[PDB]
Design a binder for this molecule. Structure first.
Ligand SMILES: [Mg+2]
Ligand SMILES: [Mg+2]
Ligand SMILES: [Mg+2]
Ligand SMILES: [Mg+2]
Ligand SMILES: [Mg+2]
Ligand SMILES: [Mg+2]
Ligand SMILES: [Mg+2]
Ligand SMILES: [Mg+2]
Ligand SMILES: [Mg+2]
Ligand SMILES: [Mg+2]
Ligand SMILES: [Mg+2]
Ligand SMILES: [Mg+2]
Ligand SMILES: [Mg+2]
Ligand SMILES: [Zn+2]
Lengths: 49, 126, 182, 116, 79
RNA sequence: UGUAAGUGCACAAGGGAGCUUGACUGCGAGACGGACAUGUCGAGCAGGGACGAAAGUCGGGACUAGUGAUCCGGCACCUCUG
């Protein structure tokens, strides 16, 4: 498939909100980006599941 | 009967300065209620002017060439600070508060930095 | 509280020698050295990139300033070269480093080359600049003969303010480059 | 030990340790050890730095080894191949120059065997 | 024998949309052009899709500036 | 100037370098053409951010193709019901 669909989840509240695509071949390791979580109210690290 | 062969450092410098000044001007503008502060830097002095782009006329200006500034014993950085507070006072007398900077292409630092801090201290909002 | 001897020579005797010999208009039409460039063309980077490190080390030892690597702007198939690879290193100095390097060269390197017959005066380009190449690098004392793995040549270029060939030739000949006689 | 960029054997007699240098051989090693006065049966564990330094100085003063020898041999090769000499032509063709029985011998020079 | 041609796309209805002397209401679209066939002037912004529009009410007034085809909006006086 | 053409870009949208994920959330005054629903842009407000001293820019990619209604069902959460 080359481009699977992945979902990003918050670390404290555990809600899956954002979804994006990536290259598993290019980046075998997992992603870690900072987005905005609505209930938490502040930027928090996000780790894909 | 001597013909120079290569372009001169003076013109490399002048052309680069003009090009980068135009680069910044592409985004930086001015208006009547917010006159633009321009600075022209030299190896021996410093110049500052206030210009309204709508009419192409200046409101006030000052430079270190003046005798009172020249009389200061301190460094030419101190001269820059002196002219900075002088232009701050002149602009306040004119009746303008909000202004923007036209660095003129010269990289920020040193004299420009000191002038900016002196202005900010004098009580101009920007 | 120091000054290179070559710089001394130049500013004391060479300047007025050339001035009186060529009858210049003012005291600053006399040409002066500008810069000097050192580089090599290997072409074996495509097959192995280890020798590049060795070249960098030799340049660092001989000059004392870490060189810079250069990439290729044109990918070519029949030479099996593509964009992005480094092939050679370039070094340029200024000022007292030129003075010291030229002193060391003129005083040590030139007399030491096996079968040294001089330098061809017709190596100029017509604008008053000099550049020539070497086939070996072990002549220099700073490099120990035991630690070299392969023989590597080099190319040397010097650029001055001479308007044309004549002024630069006179200046450098007064400096004392061992040319031929033709 | 080490000498002139050559790693001497971990455990071997000096008469062979010096032999392993390109410019020194069996009888040459015998001659240098006789001149220096160092006995020839000792192993590589009994050497001293000062003896190595003096030996290096003597050999570099009275002989050329390794890189110098290789480059001068190659200089001879290129000059003989350029002058158009018979030895130059033999080098071009890849054969011993003395004119041995190349009909059957010279296999060592010509290298492996290829069948037509 | 046959032909491999005969296919075509649709049309995007591109082109100028408002002319000079027009009373333009705030936020109106002025020109829909593909490239940068025109450059923004005073009180004129350019969108993501190379679209030129107006920011304040006024009258359309074209012009040129140093070898450019420019778009300008004049603030007609309030009656 | 990733991917065809055109329109453009020598002031850069070409290349090089430092930092960082706005490829956000809640909104939208008005227009674009369309028989129908699909399609396009947008100033400006609030929260909390990024870059930059400041002025200031950021709701993915110089622009126009990389896609698919209805019904049924799965998964996480919810101050709905029962
Ligand atoms: Mg990567
Ligand atoms: Mg020249
Ligand atoms: Mg087809
Ligand atoms: Mg069409
Ligand atoms: Mg876009
Ligand atoms: Mg760029
Ligand atoms: Mg997306
Ligand atoms: Mg509407
Ligand atoms: Mg905000
Ligand atoms: Mg916006
Ligand atoms: Mg974009
Ligand atoms: Mg881009
Ligand atoms: Mg159905
Ligand atoms: Zn959360």
């Amino acid at each position: 498939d080359v481009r699977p669909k992945i979902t990003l989840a918050c670390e404290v509240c555990k809600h899956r909100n954002y979804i994006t695509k990536k290259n598993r071949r290019n980046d075998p390791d997992r992603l870690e980006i900072k987005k905005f979580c609505p209930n938490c109210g502040t930027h928090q690290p996000h780790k894909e599941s | 009967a001597h013909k120079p062969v290569g372009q001169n450092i003076s013109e490399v410098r002048r052309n680069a300065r003009l090009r980068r000044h135009a680069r910044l001007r592409k985004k930086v503008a001015g208006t009547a209620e917010v006159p633009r502060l321009v600075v022209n830097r030299s190896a021996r002095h410093i110049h500052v002017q206030l210009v309204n782009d709508l009419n192409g006329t200046t409101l006030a200006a000052a430079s270190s060439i003046e005798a009172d500034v020249r009389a200061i014993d301190g460094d030419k950085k101190a001269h820059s600070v002196r002219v900075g507070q002088l232009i701050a006072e002149r602009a306040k007398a004119a009746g303008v508060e909000t202004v923007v900077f036209d660095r003129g292409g010269y990289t920020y630092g040193g004299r420009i930095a000191a002038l900016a801090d002196a202005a900010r201290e004098a009580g101009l909002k920007f | 509280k120091a000054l290179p001897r070559l710089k001394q020579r130049y500013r004391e005797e060479i300047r007025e020698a050339l001035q009186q010999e060529f009858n210049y208009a003012n005291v600053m039409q006399i040409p002066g050295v500008v810069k000097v460039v050192v580089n090599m063309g290997v072409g074996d980077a495509a097959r192995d990139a280890k020798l590049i490190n060795g070249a960098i080390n030799d340049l660092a030892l001989i000059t004392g300033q870490k060189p810079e690597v250069r990439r290729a702007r044109k990918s070519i198939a029949q030479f099996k070269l593509r964009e992005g690879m480094p092939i050679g290193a370039r070094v340029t100095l200024r000022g007292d480093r030129m003075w010291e390097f030229l002193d060391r060269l003129i005083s040590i390197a030139l007399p030491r080359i096996r079968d040294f017959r001089g330098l061809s005066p017709k190596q100029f380009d017509g604008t008053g600049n000099y550049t020539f190449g070497l086939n070996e690098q072990s002549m220099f004392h700073e490099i120990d003969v035991d630690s070299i793995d392969r023989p590597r040549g080099m190319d040397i270029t010097v650029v001055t303010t001479a308007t044309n060939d004549a002024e630069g030739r006179a200046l450098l000949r007064a400096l004392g480059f061992p040319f031929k006689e033709n | 030990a080490r000498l002139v960029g050559v790693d001497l054997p971990r455990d071997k007699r000096m008469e062979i340790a010096l032999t392993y240098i390109y410019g020194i051989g069996r009888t040459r090693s015998n001659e240098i050890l006789a001149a220096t006065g160092i006995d020839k049966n000792m192993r590589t564990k009994d050497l001293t730095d000062d003896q190595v330094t003096v030996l290096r100085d003597y050999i570099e003063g009275n002989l050329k080894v390794e890189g110098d020898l290789r480059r001068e041999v190659q200089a001879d090769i290129r000059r003989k191949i350029e002058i158009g000499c018979y030895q130059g032509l033999r080098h071009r063709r890849g054969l011993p120059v003395r004119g041995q029985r190349t009909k059957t011998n010279a296999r060592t020079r010509k290298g492996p065997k290829r069948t037509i | 024998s046959s032909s491999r041609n005969g296919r075509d796309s649709a049309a995007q209805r591109l082109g100028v949309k408002r002319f000079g002397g027009q009373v333009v209401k705030a936020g109106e679209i002025l020109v829909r052009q593909r490239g940068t066939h025109f450059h923004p002037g005073v009180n004129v912004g350019r969108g993501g899709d190379d679209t030129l529009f107006a920011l304040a009410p006024g009258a359309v007034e074209f012009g040129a500036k140093r070898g450019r085809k420019t778009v300008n909006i004049v603030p007609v006086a309030r009656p």
